[PDB]
Amino acid sequence: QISVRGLAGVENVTELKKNFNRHLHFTLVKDRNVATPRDYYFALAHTVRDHLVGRWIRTQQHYYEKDPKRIYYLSLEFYMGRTLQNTMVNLALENACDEATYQLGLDMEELEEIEEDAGLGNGGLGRLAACFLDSMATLGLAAYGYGIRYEFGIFNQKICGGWQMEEADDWLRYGNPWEKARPEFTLPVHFYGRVEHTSQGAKWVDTQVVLAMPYDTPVPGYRNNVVNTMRLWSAKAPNDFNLGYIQAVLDRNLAENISRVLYPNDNFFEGKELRLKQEYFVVAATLQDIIRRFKSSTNFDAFPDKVAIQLNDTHPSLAIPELMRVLVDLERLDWDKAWEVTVKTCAYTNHTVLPEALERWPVHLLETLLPRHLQIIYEINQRFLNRVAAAFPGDVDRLRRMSLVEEGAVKRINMAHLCIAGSHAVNGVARIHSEILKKTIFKDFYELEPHKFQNKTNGITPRRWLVLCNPGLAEIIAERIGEEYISDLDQLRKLLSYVDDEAFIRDVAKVKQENKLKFAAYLEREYKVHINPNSLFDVQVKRIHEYKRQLLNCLHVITLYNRIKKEPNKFVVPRTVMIGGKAAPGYHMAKMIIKLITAIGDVVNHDPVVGDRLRVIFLENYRVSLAEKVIPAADLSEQISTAGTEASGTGNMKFMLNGALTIGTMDGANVEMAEEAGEENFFIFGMRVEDVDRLDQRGYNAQEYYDRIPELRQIIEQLSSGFFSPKQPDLFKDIVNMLMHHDRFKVFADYEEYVKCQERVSALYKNPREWTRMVIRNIATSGKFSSDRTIAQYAREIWGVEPSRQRLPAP
Template sequence: MSETSTPGPGHLQLKHHYLGLDPASLKQSLANHLAYTVAKDPLTATERDWFTVTAHALRDRLIERWMETTRTYYRRDAKRVYYLSMEFLLGRALTNSALNMGVHDECCQVLAELGLSLEAIRETESDAALGNGGLGRLAACLLDSMATLRLPGYGYGIRYEYGMFNQHIRDGWQVEHPENWLRYGNPWEFPRPEVLYPVQFGGRVVEYTDAAGRFTSRWVDAETVMAMAYDTPIPGFGTNTVNNLRLWTAKSSRELDLRYFNEGDYIQAVADKNSSENLSRVLYPNDATICGRELRLKQEYFFVAATVQDILRRYLSAHADLRGLPEKVAIHLNDTHPALAIAELMRLLLDQHQLDWAAAWEITVATFSYTNHTLLPEALETWPAPMLERLLPRHLAIIHEINRRFLEQVRHRHPGDMERLRRVSLVAEGDPKRVRMAHLAIVGSHAVNGVAELHSQLLRERVFADFEALYPGRITNITNGITQRRWINQANPALAQVLNAYIGRGWVSDLDRLGELEALADDHAFQAAFAAAKHSNKQRLAGLIRQHLGQEVDPESLFDVQVKRIHEYKRQLLNVLQIITRYNRIRRHPETGWVPRTVIIAGKAAPGYRLAKLIIKLVNDVADVVNNDPAVSDRLRVVFIPNYDVTTAADIIPAADLSEQISTAGTEASGTGNMKLALNGAVTLGTLDGANIEIRAAVGAENFIEFGLDVERAAALAGGGHDPSALAAADGELLEVLEMIGGGYFSPGAPERFRPLLARLLEEGDPYLVLADYRAYLEAQERADVEFRQAQRWNRMAILNVARMGRFSSDRTVREYAERIWGVAPAPHD
């Protein structure tokens, strides 16, 4: 619903009347949209046309509930939470909307009567390319849960015209192609050309004393870009609540410069317009260059500047006193990317609304909260002060003033402790000085949370120990969660049908109901139904692999899955070492009764991350050798599935038998892929890292295959307590594998290709302890083989994984945020 003004007595009062959800009403809507939206008749309509028609029919029904939801929030003057995130990986919306609205079966029925298939139609829908990995998938889950729990929740982000990239594999290498997800339009979004805000860059700051004797700052001579809103409805499950995701696109503050155009310089005429609109063109520009880093910073400010203006506009439409803002508004920062919102709110309160510093700061801290998503020091975002000074001079001045006042408080508490001041300062010394965005987010928020118990503990004890001492209790834990609506009900209909038949549909809105499966773990009929669902998912994935990659895999084999962003700390390289070791063992002892295994790896590497891209090449080179060796190919297959996204995840995860969660202990904040895989009946093979620890505690140690160093031992070794070269020399199998990689066994035409990976392991200290965990990892894989051979035992383990995953619902996560951090309550309507 467009919100350019507040509903009131002078507004048109719409009747509370919803379009029907019955087959006849849906069929009439399809006919109307076929004629009046796509202007086709059934003889000429394509599957894409039918997707558009079906989407609009569902959208009509969402709009009615969306408008009533918005009216309810205004009518109740409800406190609202605004979730700011650079990523929202929503996936496809057609099936999700139909399921959440309770009309999936009716849609299937109506389309079947027309000789159509909902499954075929949905394949024409593009994934919304608004994210890269777990950050965006988490944000999407939380929006789903907010709407399902009927909480007044809004998402805010950027409407990227192109996603990160489409990943193609050419000769084993990752090749990036534009991800033009909007090529055919997006029927779910609503452009709001009337919702337009100026966003400034550059210029200078003028300081003066106004007529009232008040010291004042004014930002002048800045370049202006306009932010225009696009709204997307987010439906809850089994409720009429439909919340809003508002995404910003950049528009030039001036259109074509006709002076240049009329002089014949057409390129210059559009140069300024294109430069402005590049802000929302692509997700995560390559930050390997100064221009790329500058564009990234401008993106972050662009979206928070528009968002904070929009939030204040909405608040002031119904309230006069900004001191009451924290009572009606909660702004949540999903990682540090939106942290400039703290400085932006301060700027607006000080410069536009003339509040004094103390009042503005009190409002800001009470309004903001922040989720940290990383333990890696190199991943904690910082920005060069000179870049901020050039692009956002007023904000840098505000950050310096926040820092000055903050450090003064620290001096009072710890006089003479210069080292502590250096550690906690919002500005890190160096050439150049850099602004620490996590420090800004912590100091400027009333609550900070980690996303798993171990992660939050390490934040308090190690990463932000100084802040924990300064603000006891500010850093808390809220473990991540996932939505079962997307990750079983939609992604795994085979399992959903089994669950519905045995325990009813209550689990879709209350995941704790899965606990009822425990009593069925040894029931032969249920075990058979559960196993049949898994096998059908494996057959489906095998068919997709055959169709798209031309490779044959055996659905009877153990499907061993590692799907996540390619990064050294996630240790896909450790998995590759294990694959090669298994390959060598099978060749050496072909008579052994090997458990047939299909290893499935998927994930994107950042375009500028050379080693991650080299790992992808190694996976594909190893797969080429293994899959073409007749001595092992019936017992070991390796498949790299390209372009991992939400839809691909929904194809892979329901088919997984074994979930690889093998990050170095102390590096993964939480993970949500680990939750999705366990929820779909995969047994986790993992380290005690992130949420793995809580998953293990929930499902039982006997249903979790643990291996590797714990956090304390890993920290000790990473600090220089091990010699990776000595480890390799002392382990014959490991040494053989490394020599095969380094000697060109998998790259005969380029024997030096993988030397950088070996140098990372042997000469640069093996920072992620791949070699240190190698032997324990092999032993864990052997345990997985032993368990998988016992079909009934494995099936029971898988069932208990599903049964005990109730607490990992994003519904629980959102309830904790609402009660402990945001202070928001449900605002239902009929």
């Protein structure tokens, strides 16, 4: 149908059809009379999967012969989503499969909807890992993603009576055709025990053993015949485990619980033992695998020349003392040499400055679970603090501030401090964030070792986030500037010469309208909700957090409603306001915010005076597959975090690439997005970081805003009196109390500027031609935000490897 989806050649389609039929018979053990849509999906998945095999074997064989430096990306989260369409895109098989299935009497799009998301992540951090894997393969790097194979990913969200309910995400129920179990490469992991000091070094003895069984998933590069590996570890009990008899067998579950479920808490560090076990489990298994592969290439001087380990946040921070343990205790290297190797191989990426999210493990927990690692951490700290003392003599408070060991009620280990000490590179994820790191929370470390601190602005893959989810837009772009931009997104700048092109303006606007109609139809079929497709699609999708300020959005929505009720016969630009995202199960306030959104919808969506001029919809079960549907349909992207709180954001970049305009604060990557597009083409509002600081010095008093802004007063009175909860008048008292007395994120302070800015958005939307011209200016300058750019920078500036766009020979 469309050019970017590849060729549908006669021999290719014929071969695909017969292999589809073969799999339906031999693999699924079905025939056409009894086969269901799910069976057809699996037949297609196996057919496409076959095409990865030759490329996967020869890519890994190529790395063995060429022996390049290997990149190991360690993360507790890989938010992969669906794999079928992505695989077809990267292999140039999409049109061929579309034709093959069509001739079989099947709709491929219908089959694609059957696939479960691999939801092995919470949000931004997990999805970054996934985009990074795609970019590393596309850029021909010898890269490996290492994580945990959770049997249950992020929970499925159900909304019941307006409240979030959590349901287990049993994603493996029907099987996962994309993984390959490798039980032959199973490795032991040790827990508990004690440390013995013999004449020749320390010995970690009397340990409990849990086995780590790897599952490998292929990661294809874009049309370059490279297929890299994501290896995820699964926990298995040893066969002599606990070995009355029946109970011993049943107790195997305790060991295997390590890989059972993804921790869904992305707001607050809890310090749970099971989470610590997960973190060590992934680290210990991975490092054995790394060292094994290195020895197959005696002397560890060359280790950093052949290995780079990237730590995605502090979650895999135990890699640092584990590498030291292996080098000192097992390989018998001297401490100083081992430390040199460790620092040169490890690098650390930070994703937040909010203190409550930072990992600070109780010493008593590490003492019991990982006694040797605690000893190593103490020695690292002692040697590090001796360096600080030499550099800043007499500065005793610096010594307490920089210590890896935090004193107090319970002694804790600061894992961020551990990461800085043991890494040659530390990076933030957007320019403003990386600057905040150097100026605030890591200032002491920056003064000691300035050379360690870097910026690597986040990005998104244009394969999933344009070609896959928005083929209409990809096609009209390709018509003008060709196909090269898909792996070189900076070429989008060439679209600036089409900003006054009447045909292109019409085409961009047409694609958006079709996307909106498609999504409006999806909402009616799968959720039975009715929306006006001609309204402005106002979208805020992301995890529910106070700092992300879904509440500020809520205040604007109520303002719009109240203004309509005040002047019903006055014209307003029609809006569909969509808010979606999951709340961490233990995050009370976030759960209350979800309830508020639905409660507003109940009032607004059923007011006859409002009509179809304003709709408020909560998007249930927001996840990667839903993002691929809603983002291409959006007109307005809400990126409204308090300045200095969102490290980068990546949803923002997805919206920019897909033809939405952005209303946002100068926070995270928003700053660089406005810089690229021009501030005139962005709807910037609110306090800058400096303004937040000034307000903090004075002390934030919300009552002042309440007293001075009558429209704000009305809303708070409505919330307090039970206007949005007639049966439970005091339902939202927790929300009001927080806003008035304990609001860390200064919602009221940005209210006036936000409302005014929103008026300017509505004014532009009244002029379709000028709206679209501004959209073109955004799409055309989105190039910087390709994860290909991001990865090239990691490669050159941290890992010491050169990216390559050169094809591997076709199988």
